[PDB]
Hints:
monomer, mainly alpha, 64% helix, binds the ligand Cc1ccc(C(=O)N2CCN(C(=O)NCC(F)(F)F)CC2)o1, PH-interacting protein
Amino acid sequence: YDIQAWKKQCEELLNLIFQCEDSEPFRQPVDLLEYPDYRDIIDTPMDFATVRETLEAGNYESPMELCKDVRLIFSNSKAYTPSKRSRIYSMSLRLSAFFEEHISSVLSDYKSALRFHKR
Ligand SMILES: Cc1ccc(C(=O)N2CCN(C(=O)NCC(F)(F)F)CC2)o1
């Protein structure tokens, strides 16, 4: 019933994500010299360094907000990919599975803790 615990739980999950080779393409912004069409296709860039910085700044109120930005990383990769069998998109799908597997308890515990707080 700790309604602050999500933040360190998210910090540790981001640490795991940064250790994971599959996160390489998603740790920083897209160079438009390398992908000149990227911002034609993608209105709202997002990367794991921006998510970590937002968390560390104290600019997420809940793990739901963090989860929305992480999911945007993945939806951006799905929108940008030229193919469902693109290397970087395939990395996104494995990393998304890993993230969803690990964030589910963080969201459950937060929402339970907040229901207890308001009981
Ligand atoms: C070919 C394909 C399919 C899907 C994606 C994709 O999701 N992108 C574009 C490449 N990208 C970076 O260029 N990331 C920056 C750095 F420094 F890590 F390279 C990550 C986002 O790209």
